[PDB]
Amino acid sequence: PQAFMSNRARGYIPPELWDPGINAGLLNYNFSGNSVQNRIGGNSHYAYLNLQSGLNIGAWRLRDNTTWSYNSSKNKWQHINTWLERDIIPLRSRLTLGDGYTQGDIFDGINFRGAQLASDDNMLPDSQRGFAPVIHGIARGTAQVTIKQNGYDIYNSTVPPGPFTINDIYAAGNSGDLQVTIKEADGSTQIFTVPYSSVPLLQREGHTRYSITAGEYRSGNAQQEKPRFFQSTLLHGLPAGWTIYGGTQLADRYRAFNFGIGKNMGALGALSVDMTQANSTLPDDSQHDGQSVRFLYNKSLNESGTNIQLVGYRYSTSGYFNFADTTYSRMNYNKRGKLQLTVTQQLGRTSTLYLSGSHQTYWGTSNVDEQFQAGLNTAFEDINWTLSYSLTKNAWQKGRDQMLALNVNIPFSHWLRSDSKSQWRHASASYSMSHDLNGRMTNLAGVYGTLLEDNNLSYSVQTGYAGGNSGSTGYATLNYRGGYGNANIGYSHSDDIKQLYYGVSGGVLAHANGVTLGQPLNDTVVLVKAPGAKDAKVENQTGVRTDWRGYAVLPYATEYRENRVALDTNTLADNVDLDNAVANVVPTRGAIVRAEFKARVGIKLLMTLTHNNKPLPFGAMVTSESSQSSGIVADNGQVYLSGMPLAGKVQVKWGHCVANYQLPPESQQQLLTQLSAECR
Amino acid sequence: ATTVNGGTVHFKGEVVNAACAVDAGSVDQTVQLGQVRTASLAQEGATSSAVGFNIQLNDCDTNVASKAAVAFLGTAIDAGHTNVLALQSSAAGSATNVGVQILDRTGAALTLDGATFSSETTLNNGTNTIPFQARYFATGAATPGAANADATFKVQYQ
Amino acid sequence: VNGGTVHFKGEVVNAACAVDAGSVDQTVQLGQVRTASLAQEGATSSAVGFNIQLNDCDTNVASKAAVAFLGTAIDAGHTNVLALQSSAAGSATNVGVQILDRTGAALTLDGATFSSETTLNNGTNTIPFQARYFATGAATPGAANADATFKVQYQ
Amino acid sequence: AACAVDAGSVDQTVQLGQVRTASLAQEGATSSAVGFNIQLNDCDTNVASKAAVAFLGTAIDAGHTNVLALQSSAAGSATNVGVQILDRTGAALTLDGATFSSETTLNNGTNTIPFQARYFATGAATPGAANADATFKVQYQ
Amino acid sequence: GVALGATRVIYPAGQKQEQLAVTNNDENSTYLIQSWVENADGVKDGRFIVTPPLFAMKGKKENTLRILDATNNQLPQDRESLFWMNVKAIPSNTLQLAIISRIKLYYRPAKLALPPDQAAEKLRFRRSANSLTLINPTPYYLTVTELNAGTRVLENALVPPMGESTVKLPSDAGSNITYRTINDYGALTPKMTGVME
């Protein structure tokens, strides 16, 4: 049966096909400079240089980050983060020695310096990611199952006469209704429906996530100390829509244990309740024991796909502290209750009301932190207009703190024709109007778009008026994303302040085949190598072209996925023909994979060959050793060859021809040449 | 020979620690997702290849603001899928049952509400870049066409 | 405290249907020729049915794609009979293979296309066709494997 | 005296403008220097040929006697920072009243002497107002 | 089974090369792809040369066919020109099936008096006895799908630019006529009605 059969998920890639990468260096540079001129104090210069070095040897990936600052009066190199990451396939996890961060959701975000080992959800196929119910069933006889959503079908497959479990259902949003319909050739159809609502803490049935972190604690503040701590987090998906998740934080002075459950009740919604019990030592010698209970509720689609509600409550009793409170200085009011209420309502297929309300109460100080936000976005044809309102009454007498904003974006394509050849089609007009509900007014109108053939050079010119002061401000920027780097130039003009920004970003790879420059890198990169094909643009990317050696680096590549690297044959030299214009790679996290391409440099030839006044038979192989070229006879003895010399000979192996040919310089200059040559 | 006394010189100034805002040129941004096929987006939940883009901040100091995050405000195609954007209709023709989604450094989706902020980040002294990923999300079969969507993002400092 | 806006521009393009013909390598098996059975022009054989699946594409584009069969005919009179393509000791004589519609109407091999009437099964779009050996006067004990070409006009 | 100091030199104010704490985060860092000048009128070459300027002010510290102090007010003033005056040659001047600047040859009639004013922060700079004042003596040989 | 990148390839005038993808979804399949281009009458033509004309594809792979022009600007520049691009996948007792896929190649002149958007609406219907002829004043090849004459579909139609295509009509059909044309990307324009002008 299907349940016993080791069926694989949709989009599943075996771990053997995953490419570890290549042994190569790496250096990403980001230089920025600001010249600020004011009538009061003349002029000044600022320069910030971010340098991320790296080295990928074997499977280990070493990364180092450094910063340089120069003001106009000294040079200051400053380390930030160094880490040696790696991925372990048998454990389906990722290990990191050195600096890093704690991705804990059950606990609070912590920056640390030590060994971390955490399960990664990215290595799993995209089908079985997130939360989605798995379907268990018994089918009497051979059956056809059509797990179908309220809109359309999702999973259609055959099932043998036996138990079957289906776990390939996609996320399909936060809430959904799956109708399982089984049809057998003998009996009548059997249908049953199941609703589901998801919470980020929930996991799939039989899904396990873990995180083990150990090492010292680091923070930007110099007041806090650097204590060593251990943090373990576990998330498990029980059968029947439950989730059990726990955690443990431990240090010299702070010991906290977190336990929680979550449920997918179906039509009612989704729930997640957890309790954290902590014994802490304050900056002084005092010891405090406390608890904090967090509650999360997600309602299903109210009405008919109109309203969605989220309720997040958190009650922290007197004596519960996070890790920062303990790790404060040797000598340096808790939250009684925090409530979040989010309501989203969609109307007219266009307007989307978002209402957010946060309400926090402390201990002793009965002051209440209230935060009410109401946004309305509407996309009426090309015109997109958003109206937002916000209010914030905080504990420290922040008053009403009301704010209102109105942003309208109108593309020029609303007026220009569909097939306009002008560059004005790649542009839009933006208008922003901000009230502070006290007379403080900010208007800003401008245009922006792209004006290059690859849409690399992006321009944005905006004027604005600030009124109580009455200030007119101009702001014009140009960003160019070329095949060697990104260069941005900006000019901000004010009443008495003139700012000129100039920045260059780039990346350098010291791979085996020399040094390759390119756009700034983003974790995983693909090194496209097509030697002999100079200035060849790659597809689906902006301003990524090969250099004079044919080597280029792609900025971003999806990890553990099937992504296509294609060379745009249209914008390629007529003398060069690619044997393969599309390649497929499966990179690992933080890895450099070579998408090797073969390019023939000689002229493109179309030869009609005849033997004994008879065209060569179909399927015959024509090869030329003078320039290592090959082709297959199409019909009437017509064969296509790429990369051939002006004068030479070819040989045909139908099942042993030799054919001599010569071409004129006009033929060599032509794009594609056609000729005839007889066998021996 | 002779030493006499002049007047006085009065120096007027003010030492100020400056805050930070969005980098020039990163205010209005455009991202080209490329070309995707119905084979890639043929059923609900199918996602295309993510395209990276960064938001830059300049003149940020650790003392004034240790951490920062952003929140994207947009239009949802339906109340069920509130974490995906909505594509605008075009005269030539707009794709049906498809939208734009935004991810984080952790690979998690973002609620398009104006208050759901993303994960916190550490602010380096000066230039700071926050990366994000744009993706295609199909709710059912995706008819071919042109997909263009817009999103408004606001930044908070902690 | 405040930011700007980001826009995403892209294209979603339709893809032509992927055509799968019966088993792997676009091969459909047929029963062996019976010398006693294949005697007269009207003599036929067992009707082996196969199906063609137009997968990895939308049902709307799949259903609008015209369908036709073509190839070589053994004789001018036998327009609907494929000519057997075999040059060996296993080549049979005075036989052919016929591709047949659902109801039982013979399919012309000239190339006159028609609608596809794809059945939208639970999996994908499918179209069933029929194949049977056809005698034209005599039978020979040989492997009469033939070849036919399938034409799909994506309207 | 051999020369006359104009009012625009006797009583005038020079503004250094706002600066960034990053530009003065560490000790020894200096901000951008602005330029002012003092005008001498009716200068007689026969009476005197060389002119010099000595600056008198309040030094911040005994170890740093070339930096003026801040006398804005009793509160809301920048800390661990001062202002500096550089002569024509670009060197710092001692705030002692007898430490004169570089000797400059005097031309008959009207002459000008340019000086630069900049910031100088020890330790770590802190936000706040920064105001200073200093008296000077001119010597004619 | 091989598949093409698009069901409708538009080749603008003035260029030299057009790119079309051919992909093999089957993991274990060896194929020989042979491609060519014919005119509107189904006759093999040398006006467009597809490179490589014949190549061997092994396993799951995607390759690019480059359509190279040879018109020498001899085609009319007033209206679109129609060609058929054929791709045939040879699967290199049992009969073997070779699949031919034919797609529509539109040689589109660079400068045209009408944008593609307005071409869909400006179709006229001349109805008569057993005839529902379609007039297309617009200079674009129009593909009319599910032409319903009130309550019954007639058939798919392809009306040439500045042309009058003919479709037979049973007398039982109603007066109301509804249709919808296929746009560039292959989707279906929302249904319009057809006037009798």
Curated annotation (Swiss-Prot), chain A:
It is found in: Cell outer membrane. Keywords: Cell outer membrane, Disulfide bond, Fimbrium biogenesis, Membrane, Signal, Transmembrane, Transmembrane beta strand, Transport. GO terms for biological process: pilus assembly. GO terms for molecular function: fimbrial usher porin activity. It is a multi-pass membrane protein. It comes from the Bacteria. Disulfide bonds join 657-679. GO terms for cellular component: cell outer membrane. Belongs to the fimbrial export usher family. Involved in the export and assembly of FimA fimbrial subunits across the outer membrane. This is Outer membrane usher protein FimD. It comes from Escherichia coli (strain K12). The chain holds residues 161 to 878 of 878 of the full protein.
From Swiss-Prot, chain B:
It is found in: Fimbrium. Belongs to the fimbrial protein family. GO terms for biological process: cell adhesion; cell adhesion involved in single-species biofilm formation. The keyword Lipid metabolism does not apply. Fimbriae (also called pili), polar filaments radiating from the surface of the bacterium to a length of 0.5-1.5 micrometers and numbering 100-300 per cell, enable bacteria to colonize the epithelium of specific host organs. InterPro entries: Adhesion_dom_fimbrial (IPR000259), Adhesion_dom_fimbrial_sf (IPR036937), Adhesion_dom_sf (IPR008966), Bact_Fimbrial_Adh_Pro (IPR050263). The keyword Hydrolase does not apply. Keywords: Disulfide bond, Fimbrium, Signal. This is Type-1 fimbrial protein, A chain.
Swiss-Prot record, chain D:
Its main location: other. Disulfide bonds join 3-43. GO terms for molecular function: identical protein binding. Belongs to the fimbrial protein family. It is found in: Fimbrium. It comes from Escherichia coli (strain K12). This is Type-1 fimbrial protein, A chain. Fimbriae (also called pili), polar filaments radiating from the surface of the bacterium to a length of 0.5-1.5 micrometers and numbering 100-300 per cell, enable bacteria to colonize the epithelium of specific host organs. Transmembrane segments: none annotated. Keywords: Disulfide bond, Fimbrium, Signal. One of its GO terms (cellular component) is pilus. GO terms for biological process: cell adhesion; cell adhesion involved in single-species biofilm formation.
From Swiss-Prot, chain E:
GO terms for cellular component: outer membrane-bounded periplasmic space. The keyword Repressor does not apply. One of its GO terms (biological process) is chaperone-mediated protein folding. Keywords: Chaperone, Fimbrium biogenesis, Immunoglobulin domain, Periplasm, Signal. Changing residue 166 to A: In strain: Clinical isolate 149 and O2:K1:H+ / MT78. Pfam families: PapD_C (PF02753), PapD_N (PF00345). It is found in: Periplasm. Changing residue 18 to V: In strain: Clinical isolate 149 and O2:K1:H+ / MT78. Its main location: periplasm. It comes from the Bacteria. InterPro entries: Ig-like_fold, PapD-like_sf, Periplasmic_pilus_chap, Pili_assmbl_chap_C_dom_sf, Pili_assmbl_chaperone_bac, Pili_assmbl_chaperone_C, Pili_assmbl_chaperone_CS, Pili_assmbl_chaperone_N. GO terms for molecular function: protein folding chaperone. The keyword Signal applies. Belongs to the periplasmic pilus chaperone family. Required for the biogenesis of type 1 fimbriae. Binds and interact with FimH. This is Chaperone protein FimC. The gene is fimC.
